[PDB]
């Protein structure tokens, strides 16, 4: 099935560029687009930018566009992304992502959610909000959850997705679109809302459940987390 490889953590002076890579598998490498995302310690995803290996479209974050170069071998399957000056608020995990398969009903960009990610690669160097509760969510196997995030703007598009994460592993798409379970996703869990206020539910929680939540508003040229809920036992 779908997999997304990626090179080794390194360690990075002040100065230098660091040039990760992305191998996938499982399907065919220049039909899909690739994210390139990162986090910071104790900080908020970060989108960095895209790469389309099929027709070579890039879009550029701002904070990115001077010092990231994305390129592509498709030959190799490969993805590529090489940031130049690193400097101490470098020192993330960097992720590769590859977008969504088109839906039969999407609109432009519909699809453009983070389907697959990489399991990210660690470097260490020597305008829509969206706000997540609660910051933390204690319970016992059995329980429902209910997890909620407030958008600033009103999010007319319908395209917010949820993730899961526990760090070491891969983030994982739970739901996309507001409402659309994921491929391989359990009955359990499902998403719901509209303009303003959106949520994820699990309906009775078992134990492969407890990890970090992420809501997230995705687009064509902008893309933006919430900082995350805690489902700890």
């Known amino acids: 099935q779908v997999q997304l490889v990626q090179s080794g953590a390194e360690v990075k002076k002040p100065g230098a560029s660091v040039k990760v890579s992305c191998q996938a598998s499982?399907?065919?490498?220049?039909?899909?687009?690739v994210h390139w995302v990162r986090q910071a310690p104790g900080q908020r995803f970060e989108w960095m930018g895209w790469i389309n290996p099929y027709n070579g479209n890039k879009e550029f974050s701002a904070k990115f566009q001077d010092r990231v170069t994305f390129t592509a071998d498709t030959s190799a399957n490969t993805a590529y992304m090489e940031l130049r000056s690193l400097r101490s608020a470098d020192t993330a995990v960097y992720y590769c992502?590859?977008?969504?398969?088109?839906?039969?009903?999407?609109?432009?960009?519909?699809?453009?959610?983070?389907?697959?990610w990489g399991k990210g690669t660690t470097v260490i160097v020597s305008e829509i909000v969206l706000t997540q509760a609660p910051g933390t969510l204690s319970l016992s196997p059995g329980e429902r959850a209910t997890f909620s995030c407030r958008s600033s703007?009103?999010?007319?598009?319908?395209?917010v997705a949820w993730y899961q994460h526990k760090p070491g592993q891969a983030p994982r798409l739970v739901i996309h679109?507001?409402?659309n379970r994921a491929s391989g996703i359990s009955d359990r869990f499902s998403g719901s809302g509209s303009g303003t206020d959106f949520t994820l539910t699990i309906t009775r929680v078992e134990p492969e459940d407890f990890a970090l939540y992420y809501c997230?508003?995705?687009?064509?040229?902008?893309?933006?987390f919430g900082q995350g809920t805690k489902l700890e036992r």
């Open positions: 992502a590859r977008v969504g398969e088109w839906g039969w009903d999407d609109s432009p960009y519909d699809n453009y959610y983070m389907d697959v």
């Open positions: 997230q508003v995705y687009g064509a040229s902008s893309y933006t």
């Open positions: 499982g399907y065919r490498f220049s039909h899909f687009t």
């Open positions: 703007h009103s999010i007319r598009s319908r395209r």
């Open positions: 679109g507001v409402s």
